[PDB]
Amino acid sequence: SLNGKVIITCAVTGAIHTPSMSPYLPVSASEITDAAIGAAEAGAAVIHLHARHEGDGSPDQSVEAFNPILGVIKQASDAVLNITTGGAPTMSIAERIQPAQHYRPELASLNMGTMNFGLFPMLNRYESQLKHQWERNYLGNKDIIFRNTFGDVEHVMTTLGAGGTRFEFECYDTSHLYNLKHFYDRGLVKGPLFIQTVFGLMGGIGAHPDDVLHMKRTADRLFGQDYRWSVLGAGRNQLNIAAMSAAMGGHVRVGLEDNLWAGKGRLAETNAQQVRAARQIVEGLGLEVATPAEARELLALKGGDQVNF
């Protein structure tokens, strides 16, 4: 019965885009919860969550920052809440791990390799618009290392896994799939693996169709039937890559964390706006958007009532 069900994840704000880039980027806790609830009611079964300082909008990966967010969304929606362990790519593991460790979510992101994270491409378009000094230092930083060593990843699996949390394994290139294979063969994570292949980041693999098929092909060969595929296309590749995945039996992620645009010369005003576009592609293919309960079964999650919020 779960055949032909597509899971839409909506990543509502993230840590990469900054407030000066768009007035529609959710910053406050109430903006983030409204964006999440609106996206779930449009058909997002999973909400991927970051938090921000309400003062200047900078990334906030503290336990307290999620307190006015998680419980509010849960009361209003049964969507699966996916808490970031990535935060801002400049953060340490000790900092990034605390929210998921405390709240024991059904799902948490797990980044699978250390990589350069380049943001200066966003300086070409946005430098003159930046209003906060932290935005200038952040996007100008040519030395960002998004740290996820083999020791880090093993520690996160062990720590968060004890609380029943399952992972969205974020894979930005082929090597991250091989890294995941290493832990999968050691039995440190069990199937079905929720593998998200991320396309178009500076420091990661590109967004060419060859890149998509290569990651899909590699995942197929390394993990067979024991994984569920999701994709993330950055910027204007968002909907193109979501459609490829939906057409190939995979799942999709949209959201203002990854793309600020709704069309040509047009910024996206809400996260739900992007969920509806993906949903239109899903239903045009003759498929159906998965409910949260259907996502929990496809991904083997512990249930929205087994969390600490």
Place this chain on the structure above:
Amino acid sequence: LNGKVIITCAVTGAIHTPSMSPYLPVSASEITDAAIGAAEAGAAVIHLHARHEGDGSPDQSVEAFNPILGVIKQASDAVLNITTGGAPTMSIAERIQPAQHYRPELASLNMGTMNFGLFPMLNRYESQLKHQWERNYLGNKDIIFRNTFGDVEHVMTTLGAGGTRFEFECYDTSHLYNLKHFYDRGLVKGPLFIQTVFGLMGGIGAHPDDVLHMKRTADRLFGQDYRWSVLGAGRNQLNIAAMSAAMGGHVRVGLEDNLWAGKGRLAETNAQQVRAARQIVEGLGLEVATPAEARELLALKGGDQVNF
């Protein structure tokens, strides 16, 4: 024109038979109704076969298109694309006669000789076949769709003289290489309307790797001098259409290629499949090409410079 997707609708064809679906257009008026509805739903190109109204069998004669082409033209400015293949069991200088006489903007052109397999189609439909010609057709394990190098060279010369440009039908890698041979000799000038056909028994399959392989090969052989369209047979129709739309290509739908809408549900109109492809195209943030935009992308002569 950068974000415009041409939807071609093939309304009846010659592979499916009337016993397979009551919605398959057969009579001339059913074909014209199907074509006009598909155009109004957003199909810029209509791909056309004719059939004998008696038993529904393929009819590739000149007169068969007479009550079809003019009727559609009067009601729509869609590009009319006349088959030169017909049923895969037919000859050449005769197969090109409809397009030769009517001088359409577009004609299909199959790029290689291949086996055509339909006897698995017999597995499910054998019970409900009404006409004897359907049983012989589908049970035939010796169908050869003939398109020799000499045949293809003849079509390009003969039909090119009428101002007709071609939709190059490519069912496997060899057909792209066959097209590269003629392209290099200058027998066809760009932009090439290359249609890669997936899922037929006797052709390449419909796996996503098959799609990317044909795309990569076309990119390497023809660069920027071609326009890519896809045809996904049967249940692969919309999946492969979505891949193409997402990769900068164009899409073909229609009851010639797929009789099914969902699970155990037959498609009732061609327009219904056009609407689905259109929903995908627009969900992607793209727009469906008008007939006028298709004519520019494909370098066609105009819907008023034909012989009908």
Place this chain on the structure above:
Amino acid sequence: LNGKVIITCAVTGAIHTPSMSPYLPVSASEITDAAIGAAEAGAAVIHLHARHEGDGSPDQSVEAFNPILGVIKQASDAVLNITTGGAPTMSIAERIQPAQHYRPELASLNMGTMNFGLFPMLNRYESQLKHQWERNYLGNKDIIFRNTFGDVEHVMTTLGAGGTRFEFECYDTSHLYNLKHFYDRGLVKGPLFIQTVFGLMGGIGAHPDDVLHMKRTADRLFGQDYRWSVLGAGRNQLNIAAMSAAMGGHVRVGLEDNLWAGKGRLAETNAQQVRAARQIVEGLGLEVATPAEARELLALKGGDQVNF
């Protein structure tokens, strides 16, 4: 057997003609000398055609192999692989007669109907063609190598009854899918000796992406139940052989497939191409398969259980 590479040598074939090279074996004794030298250089399988000694044209009769098979068998324990294709312009129940009568361990089996293009070969050789049949053959733009689904099913049944296993000749993706159809019906049992042929006009090209595409497709359709061999036409012979050897596959060489040794240099013997492939195989740290190791990898009946 894990690091053993089967070298097949195709000593003369039916595509090249005698005016193209004085080293192309024609007479029966030239073919047997070529086969024995290739086996002694390390070729475990010898792939065989016969020719008329009068003008060098293909000869696919039963008697044509009589002074060939027994001579080779007496001098070598190589696996003898008899063509069922002959010249691409030939019929079926007759084409299978040599293999039907002699009941070899191996027979070739072409898996699809395709165009065969040789008129570009005419570009360079037209000046030096001695026999009229060479000019008509190479200039023919209408060659159709016929292998319908019904034809192939007939060969599998008829020749399978003699204990003969097949080398499935696959010239494009569709031929692997065609083979998958018969494999699923149980008409051929593994391990399948699948030979992917690259570089022919009418088939897939010889680009590295073409090689990987055929390999990927075969892996997905047949898994571990097949043995992969490659044939790179002309100048691609050793490049594609090296890719296969490096990827766990097997290699085919021979003057049937390539007349050239280097730049403007004709290959003088089949053994010479076998030695080259062997140098590559051993440079990789692998070993060339003996005939006895080939028989185990391919599940053959034995060189003494034949009718010659």
Place this chain on the structure above:
Amino acid sequence: SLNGKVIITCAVTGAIHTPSMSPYLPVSASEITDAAIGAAEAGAAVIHLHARHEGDGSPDQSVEAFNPILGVIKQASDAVLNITTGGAPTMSIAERIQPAQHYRPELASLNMGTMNFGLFPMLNRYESQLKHQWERNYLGNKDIIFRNTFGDVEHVMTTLGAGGTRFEFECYDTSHLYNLKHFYDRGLVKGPLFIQTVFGLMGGIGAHPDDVLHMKRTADRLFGQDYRWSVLGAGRNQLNIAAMSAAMGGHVRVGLEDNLWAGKGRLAETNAQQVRAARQIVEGLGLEVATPAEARELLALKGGDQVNF
């Protein structure tokens, strides 16, 4: 005339393998120079060089460590000398850059992205054989980050480029090709680009034929005709991947830096042994091994007489 010429690089010792793994790993300066000269006389046009402490064989990336190596090889051979800027993957950029900066070689390696570097797979086979404590700490370290940020890479290009040195761009995955494309489009390096795609490392892309074709395909699309392709296959993939490259118009790297084995149950005794095997594949294909002078033309190098040793 340079058509059909294959460049063989021989990497004689490296920094990854350790002395306890094989008694044939060159350690002393005289062992390294003998290995280099023997490999060049077998047909290696380029020698890729690391140095080691003669005491315990640990990696030595000091300027002084190359002093008894470079001049000795140059006097005995006209091979192109390729000095590592990678050193041991635990080293900083300030340390790793000094040899190439001082000696101004024709060629230096340039690693194109930050990555995990996993060596514990080598602990499964070798742990009981290790004789030095530094070997145990090194191979057991699950937290190795091979640092090559965008800022680092730009700095190395600028610094070493002023001395006429050209680069072997070491690419361990698709993202490193995209990283190189970024600098190539900014004009910070000029063609022909010597791009080496590295296969089989833990933390990098694997050694499956699909991985090889993917990297080749991506390089083709991003750089067209303006690059020269070399490959490195780790361990027992060394000769397989060298053959694929040679068959596809690329160049090859062998050496005990990457593979300790000559066959089944047989350690390789010399670097030249591996050069001869690759040469046998090259000549079996009907191609020819490039001379040093031919390598200098294919790679646009400044000449062996324009170095500071």
